[PDB]
Design an enzyme around this catalytic site. Structure first.
Site, short mmCIF file in Angstrom:
data_model
loop_
_atom_site.label_atom_id
_atom_site.label_comp_id
_atom_site.label_asym_id
_atom_site.label_seq_id
_atom_site.Cartn_x
_atom_site.Cartn_y
_atom_site.Cartn_z
N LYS A 48 57.48 -17.48 24.09
CA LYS A 48 56.65 -17.03 25.18
C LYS A 48 57.37 -17.36 26.53
O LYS A 48 58.07 -18.37 26.66
CB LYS A 48 55.28 -17.71 25.08
CG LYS A 48 54.25 -17.35 26.16
CD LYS A 48 52.92 -18.01 25.82
CE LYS A 48 51.82 -17.73 26.84
NZ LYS A 48 50.54 -18.42 26.45
N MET A 91 49.06 -15.80 33.00
CA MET A 91 48.70 -16.32 31.66
C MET A 91 47.21 -16.60 31.49
O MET A 91 46.76 -16.95 30.40
CB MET A 91 49.53 -17.55 31.26
CG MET A 91 51.01 -17.29 31.06
SD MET A 91 51.89 -18.71 30.35
CE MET A 91 51.63 -20.02 31.60
N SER A 95 47.05 -15.11 25.97
CA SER A 95 48.22 -14.77 26.77
C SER A 95 49.56 -14.71 26.01
O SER A 95 50.54 -14.20 26.56
CB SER A 95 48.31 -15.70 27.98
OG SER A 95 48.51 -17.04 27.56
N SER A 96 49.62 -15.22 24.78
CA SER A 96 50.88 -15.12 24.00
C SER A 96 51.02 -13.75 23.34
O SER A 96 51.36 -13.64 22.16
CB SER A 96 51.00 -16.24 22.92
OG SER A 96 50.51 -17.51 23.40
N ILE A 142 45.07 -22.31 26.29
CA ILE A 142 44.07 -23.09 27.06
C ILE A 142 42.62 -22.64 26.79
O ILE A 142 41.69 -23.39 27.04
CB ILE A 142 44.36 -23.12 28.60
CG1 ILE A 142 44.07 -24.52 29.14
CG2 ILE A 142 43.56 -22.05 29.37
CD1 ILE A 142 44.59 -24.76 30.56
N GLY A 143 42.46 -21.43 26.26
CA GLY A 143 41.15 -20.85 25.98
C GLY A 143 41.21 -19.92 24.78
O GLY A 143 40.22 -19.26 24.47
N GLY A 144 42.36 -19.86 24.10
CA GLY A 144 42.52 -19.04 22.90
C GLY A 144 43.84 -18.30 22.83
O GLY A 144 44.08 -17.50 21.91
N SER A 145 44.72 -18.57 23.80
CA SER A 145 45.91 -17.74 24.01
C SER A 145 46.97 -17.71 22.91
O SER A 145 47.92 -16.94 23.00
CB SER A 145 46.58 -18.08 25.35
OG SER A 145 45.80 -17.61 26.42
C1 LIG Z 1 45.17 -18.62 27.18
O1 LIG Z 1 44.57 -19.60 26.31
C2 LIG Z 1 44.13 -17.95 28.07
C3 LIG Z 1 42.92 -17.36 27.33
C4 LIG Z 1 41.79 -17.29 28.34
C5 LIG Z 1 41.25 -18.50 28.77
C6 LIG Z 1 40.22 -18.55 29.70
C7 LIG Z 1 39.70 -17.38 30.23
C8 LIG Z 1 38.59 -17.44 31.23
C9 LIG Z 1 37.59 -18.40 31.12
C10 LIG Z 1 36.55 -18.47 32.06
C11 LIG Z 1 36.49 -17.56 33.12
C12 LIG Z 1 37.49 -16.59 33.24
C13 LIG Z 1 38.53 -16.53 32.30
C14 LIG Z 1 40.23 -16.15 29.81
C15 LIG Z 1 41.28 -16.09 28.86
C16 LIG Z 1 46.24 -19.33 28.03
N1 LIG Z 1 47.53 -19.57 27.87
C17 LIG Z 1 47.94 -20.23 28.94
C18 LIG Z 1 46.91 -20.41 29.76
C19 LIG Z 1 46.95 -21.11 31.07
N2 LIG Z 1 48.04 -21.83 31.39
C20 LIG Z 1 48.10 -22.47 32.58
C21 LIG Z 1 49.33 -23.27 32.92
O2 LIG Z 1 49.42 -23.78 34.06
O3 LIG Z 1 50.21 -23.40 32.05
C22 LIG Z 1 47.05 -22.39 33.48
C23 LIG Z 1 45.93 -21.65 33.17
C24 LIG Z 1 45.88 -21.00 31.94
O4 LIG Z 1 45.81 -19.84 29.20
#
Ligand SMILES: *[C@](=O)([C][C]C1=[C][C]=C(C2=[C][C]=[C][C]=[C]2)[C]=[C]1)C1=N[C]=C(C2=NC(C([O])=O)=[C][C]=[C]2)O1
Ligand SMILES: *[C@](=O)([C][C]C1=[C][C]=C(C2=[C][C]=[C][C]=[C]2)[C]=[C]1)C1=N[C]=C(C2=NC(C([O])=O)=[C][C]=[C]2)O1
Ligand SMILES: CCCCCCCCCCCCO
Ligand SMILES: [Cl-]
Lengths: 546, 545
Positions: free
Chosen positions: A110, A159, A185-186, A206-209
């Site tokens: 990634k 991401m 995001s991956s 961070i939330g399922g990526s």
């Molecule tokens: C994924 O896990 C992102 C999946 C995701 C998570 C949260 C939301 C959301 C939640 C509440 C309101 C609006 C949107 C939508 C989709 C992922 N991979 C990386 C990240 C991430 N990385 C960083 C970092 O600094 O490395 C920061 C933020 C998110 O999220």
């Protein structure tokens, strides 16, 4: 006011194009010298077999490398998952440590896994033309284990999304159906591995990526406890947010590959390069255990109504787990709406999104982000008022909006303590039923391109386990049938708000797409979680290659 | 409005009084049944041999327990270290798991280790008469390992102090000298263990609170990495602060005792009772290693001028390590003033002290806290103004004051990230010198009573390692000579501010008091840290092994 961002996009597309051209040249040259190689046999070998033949000398690392390179190049044509060819990987190839547990294995990364000499743009203008000074720790460890990282794969801008488009490299498409999101995001990894262009990759979550793209593209992925693997040297976009920790982990075609990757990363090299990671070696005896499990399960989280295919997927897995001697126990973590609306969303956006928004200044906002940036930019008082107006009709929307407001350090402390207590609450609930592991639905099938950003509520199944910081993984168990797809037509959702309405439309036309379940264990129990993932894989796909 | 605080103190004192009386009766009852017991010989056994005798049957758990009980009661007479007798511990004694690694060992607990049926007041009125409803996880694990927790020991009010007085139970005194602080906040433990009243205890540490009382009272103590041991069920006064890591750990008469305690705690019971703790078993072989070490060292941190005894203790230990074939390498973590003033202080006080202050509403403020509460109560604008005024003459005081102001979540994220970057920066330094361990001065000798609260600067040696979250232990290595003590008259401090002035006076009149060094290793390397502590103990005080 976008000249800088237009120039960054222009240079990024030129670099992507030239990478692809370089890959093709290397591949064509290799095929010239080696017209007799059976590339199909080599490409369909499961990773464990691949590894064994690399170790024994039956396959040469060059053969495996250029064969995967060409496949990656080919599948990219229809997916647009590759952003950069990691240039010096051919020399890394010739110097790969011969006793590495991943000797000669091409690995895809990634884009956020910093690789020396290369940008990690995250699709963001402000990160263009800023090549990393050095490899991140996990990349170093992969190399010390003889792997050959060879491509950077696409991510949605920033991401912070479970789709996969940005204004620099554009949109990545699902390999199963090009009008579908690969997830994110991956997403680049999902699309690449899912179409056979890489035997192993690393994502973050961070939330399922890690889990979204794995499920949407029909591959296996694991998100370990946040601090099981080192995040040192990773490119990020929000720094110092620790309420909801980021986790990194492997994606691959089968559960055993995830186990090998974890076993390779969890070595002295990792523990000495990043002393902040607890030196917990991979416990093989736990992974290879085959005792009967007490399996907690739920068919729905009562938050995101499962698609008929998600629900069938879950129920059939429960049923086969029961036929195989396991004990299946109905179980639902308490207070899910609090975990999602207040703790997760609050943790992720404790500062109202100001830190996150610094990334977007002077940049285009990719349509796949929906209204996230516009919403975050609203003044706190206005988020508050709007939330009050929405509460009566659409409580879910109201609850997210109110929790994306800025707040004091004092309230952050209060929130962190709540996250900590919630984690103990669910641990206690789990122990009161004496569970070993937990089986849950996983979002699927894949949503239309540019819809994940309008269906935020659907992160509920995965994001719960970032809040809790439990290891959680996903395994493909079925495909959408005509009947699943027809029943999706009666789908209402529990709230009837814009998120429910979008989800129904976004899942239309899905016959044949992969659907997964999710496997969860307690913190630090990656081995047990993988043991359980292996069990589900044996039962639900009994024809998968050994 | 002080009726409530007064009432609380009256009840707390009556409870303490009834507990000591219960101990006295139990002790006398036992002594009459056991007139031929060689109590002195039992009390003197190193813990390791004591454990071995209990496991074989040579000693009964009752003999060990009641003998330590009588000693605890005796030494409490002059130290006031015991707040409560853990009532049902006699029943626990008859039920201790026979194969537990700590079978029959009596263990003393800092008051914040929740124990079913008992207050954990922290010296605060609002916590008085509010008993815990369950054992904290480490108490559970101690009991599952056959140990017998038997007393709660005193702490300074709220625990945010390295002295040891509160308005409920009053003041704990150093067992070596009654005019001296026993240190803290784990001060009751230091005073009780250091006078022979307990073979083993548990303390907590956010800026030195295991290490101060250990050093000041002449015993060994270890602050592990923050999450090596479970904090689940502990009583606290500030919740959700994660920038600067709170740690719990063992205190005892020797290094082997700390290693035994860690080995017993780091078991299946702990890891299943609190899955949030990484299941890292104690690596015996790392602790037992006898390979030469690369030891980084410094003899001052350029922030707190070491006392002459601290200095000498450090240099002598350095020289004995050299003589034993270790490699001694000069090393100082970068940017200490920043780590202390911006990161550590800003981390502990990100909300301007507001959460902390809630604990004191309606309560007396113990004099040993000095002006901390008065200062935290000031409006942010006024802390800022006062900081500006002090800056030109008193940069340290100005820096602490500015960094104790409240801030937004956004500013706290930035601080958290700086903490994380700082930790990697010191790791990188350590790597580039290929260090195994690090040897530093430890604050000592003990300060006069009621002065630690007025010499906040002196937390520098210890707090640095909470900021970095590295494991850090201390080992007694020498005692203050008249020569060391007279040299206090030439001590100026590096700053000449009120902290330096208080510290100079407070460290005087310490002839004969114990003085320690600090031993540090990388995160999660408790066994290597203990291996090094064992080495120091063996080279400076051979009699302990
Ligand atoms: C994924 O896990 C992102 C999946 C995701 C998570 C949260 C939301 C959301 C939640 C509440 C309101 C609006 C949107 C939508 C989709 C992922 N991979 C990386 C990240 C991430 N990385 C960083 C970092 O600094 O490395 C920061 C933020 C998110 O999220
Ligand atoms: C001890 O480690 C306290 C030692 C100490 C630390 C910091 C300061 C200080 C620093 C800067 C300005 C003013 C004062 C003075 C002395 C210890 N043991 C426990 C704690 C503690 N615990 C909690 C909790 O909730 O468990 C909260 C705060 C402190 O500190
Ligand atoms: C919330 C239920 C527990 C309250 C009972 C009395 C309080 C005892 C405090 C000791 C535990 C610290 O969390
Ligand atoms: Cl951790």
């Amino acid at each position: 006011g976008r000249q800088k961002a237009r120039g960054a996009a222009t240079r990024a597309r030129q670099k992507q194009r030239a990478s692809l051209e370089t890959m093709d040249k290397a591949v064509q040259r290799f095929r010239l010298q080696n017209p007799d190689l059976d590339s199909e046999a080599l490409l369909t070998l499961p990773l464990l077999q691949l590894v064994q033949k690399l170790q024994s000398g039956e396959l040469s690392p060059e053969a495996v490398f250029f064969t995967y390179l060409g496949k990656a190049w080919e599948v990219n044509k229809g997916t647009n998952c590759v952003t950069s060819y990691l240039t010096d990987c051919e020399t890394q190839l010739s110097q790969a440590p011969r006793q590495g547990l991943l000797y000669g294995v091409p690995v895809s990364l990634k884009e956020c896994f910093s690789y020396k000499g290369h940008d990690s743009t995250l699709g963001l203008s402000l990160n263009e033309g800023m090549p990393s000074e050095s490899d991140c720790v996990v990349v170093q460890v992969l190399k010390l284990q003889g792997a050959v990282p060879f491509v950077h794969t696409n991510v949605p801008q920033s991401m912070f999304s479970y789709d996969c488009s940005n204004p620099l490299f554009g949109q990545t498409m699902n390999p199963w159906k090009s009008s579908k999101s690969p997830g994110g995001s991956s997403g680049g990894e999902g699309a690449l591995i899912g179409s056979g262009g890489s035997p192993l990759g690393l994502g973050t979550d961070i939330g399922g990526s890690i889990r979204f793209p794995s499920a949407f593209c029909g591959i296996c992925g694991l998100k370990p406890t946040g601090n099981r693997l080192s995040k040192s040297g990773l490119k990020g976009c929000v720094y110092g947010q620790t309420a909801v920790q980021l986790s990194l982990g492997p994606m691959a075609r089968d559960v055993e590959s995830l186990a090998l990757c974890l076993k390779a990363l969890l070595c002295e090299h990792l523990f000495t390069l990043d002393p902040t990671v607890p030196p917990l070696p991979f416990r093989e005896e736990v992974y290879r255990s085959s005792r009967p499990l007490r399996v907690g399960y739920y068919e729905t989280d009562n938050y995101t109504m499962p698609s008929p295919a998600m629900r069938r997927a879950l129920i059939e897995t429960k049923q086969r787990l029961e036929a195989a001697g396991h004990t299946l126990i109905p179980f639902l973590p308490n207070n899910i709406p609090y975990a999602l609306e207040v703790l997760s969303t609050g943790g992720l956006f404790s500062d109202g999104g100001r830190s996150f928004l610094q990334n977007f200044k002077g940049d285009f906002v990719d349509p796949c982000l929906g209204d996230l940036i516009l919403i975050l930019r609203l003044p706190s008082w206005f988020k508050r008022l709007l939330s009050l107006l929405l509460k009566p009709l659409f409580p879910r929307l109201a609850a997210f909006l109110n929790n994306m407001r800025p707040r004091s350090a004092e309230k952050l402390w209060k929130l962190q303590h709540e996250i900590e207590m919630y984690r103990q609450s669910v641990i206690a609930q789990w122990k009161a039923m004496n569970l070993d592991v937990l089986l849950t639905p996983m979002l699927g099938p894949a949503l239309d391109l540019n819809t994940p950003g309008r269906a935020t509520g659907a992160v509920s199944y995965t994001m719960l386990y970032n809040c809790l910081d439990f290891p959680a993984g996903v395994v493909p168990v079925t495909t959408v049938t005509a009947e699943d797809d027809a029943q999706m037509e009666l789908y209402k959702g529990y709230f009837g708000d814009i998120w429910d309405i979008i989800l129904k439309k976004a899942m239309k036309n899905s016959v044949g797409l992969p659907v997964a379940v999710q496997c969860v264990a307690l913190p630090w129990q990656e081995e047990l979680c993988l043991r359980f993932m292996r069990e589900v894989e044996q039962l639900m796909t009994p024809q998968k290659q050994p």
